[PDB]
Amino acid sequence: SSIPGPGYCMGIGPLISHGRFLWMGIGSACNYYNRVYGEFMRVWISGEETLIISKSSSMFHIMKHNHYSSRFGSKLGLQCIGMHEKGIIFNNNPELWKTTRPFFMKALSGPGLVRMVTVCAESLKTHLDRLEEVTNESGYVDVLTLLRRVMLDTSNTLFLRIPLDESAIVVKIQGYFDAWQALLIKPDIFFKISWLYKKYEKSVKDLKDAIEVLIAEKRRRISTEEKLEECMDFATELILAEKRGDLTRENVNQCILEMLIAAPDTMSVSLFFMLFLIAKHPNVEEAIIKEIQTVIGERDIKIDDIQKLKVMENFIYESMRYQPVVDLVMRKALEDDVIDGYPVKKGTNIILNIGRMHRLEFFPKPNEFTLENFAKNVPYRYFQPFGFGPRGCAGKYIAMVMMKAILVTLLRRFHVKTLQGQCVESIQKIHDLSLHPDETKNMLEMIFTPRN
Ligand code: HEM
Ligand SMILES: C[C@]12CCC(=O)C=C1CC[C@@H]1[C@@H]2CC[C@]2(C)C(=O)CC[C@@H]12
């Protein structure tokens, strides 16, 4: 089979599609092209031919095989944000990625995943006792900020544990994300005219500098620690690997940064959507509350509780399926292969449109929010909210633990109301690198009214 997609108009084809991506945003442009042309089609970002695919079969092939364990993006953009061959998220050097990923995998499972359930609860409790920090005169709670702050506090106390300015770092993380999202697929031309990006450059330096202060302190405490065996964590593991000859300092620093931003970026927006859904689906909210009473009562949340929270689990899955944040995955072909019917040359970029996939393929009622979509065991080859395989989400398991933990301890204590008519469907959204609320609009607040 040949490859569907717009015509290469002697070098105008590329310029339209790239422009379309820049104007529309990666996400929406992906949905546009899959709607016009097939569920498997071809576009250009910069020079490179880039496939946009929503086919579950293609999805599965790509995530399963080692020769797609790469992403893509502007080299200049990635260098600017410090992710060019440095972190893991957008580290596209196969060997450097291969040797960095293990550090993330260790910290995000085993004992750390067990600690996380209780660390999460405490962090949320502490902030729910400080609602004055985030609540309006008319009782409007800034949930986005609240969530980001606990997500950061959580990540810090688990992976780095150095005291920090919660509120400041949160704003800086938001700054970093904009830069990341802004520069990821800008053409090289863009980077020539400098009063066009120095904006983003300063956001990166803001966060990076702020984190250096923290890593610097972490280095001191380690160099004077008596029971070094007793108190291992993610940052320490990296620093020791660096003091063998295994890692670069630049690399260590980017890793710590990537580990700190991950949950604030994705978990908080995810939980936010989840909370709005709860507010608009009383039936579902009752099921959850009943399950909590049955399983937990008023005991503190514990690791052994999490498997038992079946209703919630399905709620989280359905929320993610219906209202994704991470609706698209960027990959690159490292070897030549034939995928379904189509030839895929090495160096070909790939965007997997998992959000659209979850609305076309397996589910009984794709275009409406129901736990019915999860009434029967769903094969992981038709539902990929995290990705799987050698480069699937590093936090895929701990994420489920965290989301359960915070959903439990929040709803346990508060009923959540939405302002006016507002629901996830009516929220104005940016659909670019991820799918999130446009925060230049308003009516994004909620009302937290007590229980009992
Ligand atoms: C609901 C929250 C989350 C969602 C929806 C999500 C989803 C995803 C997806 C779809 C990917 C791409 C995987 C692939 O290419 O197949 C990814 C990558 C990644 N995620 Fe998450 N994730 C979440 C939470 C987290 C958390 C809490 C962490 C750690 C604190 C994390 C760390 C990472 C890292 C480091 C990568 C890059 C992996 C690599 O390229 O090797 N994620 N995530
Ligand atoms: C999950 C994630 C990493 C942690 C973080 O801090 C924020 C995000 C959101 C964007 C994700 C990214 C991982 C790589 C993803 C899946 C892509 O290939 C395109 C969108 C992008």
Swiss-Prot record:
Which residues are involved in binding heme? 393
According to the record, mutating residue 220 to C results in: 1.6 fold decrease in affinity for androstenedione substrate; slightly affects PKA-mediated reduction in catalytic activity as measured in vitro by estrone synthesis from androstenedione (49% decrease compared with 36% for the wild-type protein); no effect on PKG/PRKG1-mediated reduction in catalytic activity in vitro
Cell compartments where the protein resides: Endoplasmic reticulum membrane; Microsome membrane
Q: In which pathway does it act?
A: Steroid hormone biosynthesis
Q: How is it modified after translation?
A: Phosphorylated in vitro by PKA and PKG/PRKG1. These phosphorylations inhibit the catalytic activity as measured by estrone synthesis from androstenedione (36% decrease for PKA and 30% for PKG/PRKG1).
The superkingdom listed in its UniProt entry is Eukaryota
Keyword Transmembrane assigned: yes
Signal peptide residues are none
Reactions this protein catalyses: testosterone + 3 reduced [NADPH--hemoprotein reductase] + 3 O2 = 17beta-estradiol + formate + 3 oxidized [NADPH--hemoprotein reductase] + 4 H2O + 4 H(+); androst-4-ene-3,17-dione + 3 reduced [NADPH--hemoprotein reductase] + 3 O2 = estrone + formate + 3 oxidized [NADPH--hemoprotein reductase] + 4 H2O + 4 H(+); androst-4-ene-3,17-dione + reduced [NADPH--hemoprotein reductase] + O2 = 19-hydroxyandrost-4-ene-3,17-dione + oxidized [NADPH--hemoprotein reductase] + H2O + H(+); 19-hydroxyandrost-4-ene-3,17-dione + reduced [NADPH--hemoprotein reductase] + O2 = 19-oxo-androst-4-ene-3,17-dione + oxidized [NADPH--hemoprotein reductase] + 2 H2O + H(+)
Cofactor list: heme
Q: Which PROSITE patterns match?
A: CYTOCHROME_P450 (PS00086)
Q: Which terms in the Gene Ontology molecular function aspect does this entry carry?
A: aromatase activity; electron transfer activity; estrogen 2-hydroxylase activity; heme binding; iron ion binding; oxidoreductase activity, acting on paired donors, with incorporation or reduction of molecular oxygen, reduced flavin or flavoprotein as one donor, and incorporation of one atom of oxygen; oxygen binding; steroid hydroxylase activity
Which keywords, in A-to-Z order, does the entry hold? Disease variant, Endoplasmic reticulum, Heme, Iron, Lipid metabolism, Membrane, Metal-binding, Microsome, Monooxygenase, Oxidoreductase, Pseudohermaphroditism, Transmembrane, Transmembrane helix
Q: Which GO terms describe its biological process?
A: androgen catabolic process; estrogen biosynthetic process; female genitalia development; female gonad development; mammary gland development; negative regulation of chronic inflammatory response; negative regulation of macrophage chemotaxis; positive regulation of estradiol secretion
Quote the annotated effect of residue 391 to C. Answer: In AROD; 1.1% of wild-type activity
Residues recorded as binding substrate, renumbered to this chain, are: 265, 330
> What EC number is given for this enzyme?
1.14.14.14
Q: Which Pfam families match?
A: p450 (PF00067)
Where is it made, tissue-wise?
Widely expressed, including in adult and fetal brain, placenta, skin fibroblasts, adipose tissue and gonads.
Functional summary from the UniProt entry: A cytochrome P450 monooxygenase that catalyzes the conversion of C19 androgens, androst-4-ene-3,17-dione (androstenedione) and testosterone to the C18 estrogens, estrone and estradiol, respectively. Catalyzes three successive oxidations of C19 androgens: two conventional oxidations at C19 yielding 19-hydroxy and 19-oxo/19-aldehyde derivatives, followed by a third oxidative aromatization step that involves C1-beta hydrogen abstraction combined with cleavage of the C10-C19 bond to yield a phenolic A ring and formic acid.
Q: Please name the disease the record associates with this protein.
A: Aromatase excess syndrome: An autosomal dominant disorder characterized by increased extraglandular aromatization of steroids that presents with heterosexual precocity in males and isosexual precocity in females. Aromatase deficiency: A rare disease in which fetal androgens are not converted into estrogens due to placental aromatase deficiency. Thus, pregnant women exhibit a hirsutism, which spontaneously resolves after post-partum. At birth, female babies present with pseudohermaphroditism due to virilization of extern genital organs. In adult females, manifestations include delay of puberty, breast hypoplasia and primary amenorrhoea with multicystic ovaries.
- PANTHER family for the chain: AROMATASE, CYTOCHROME P450 FAMILY 4
Q: Which named protein is this?
A: Aromatase
Its taxonomic path starts at: Eukaryota, Metazoa, Chordata, Craniata, Vertebrata
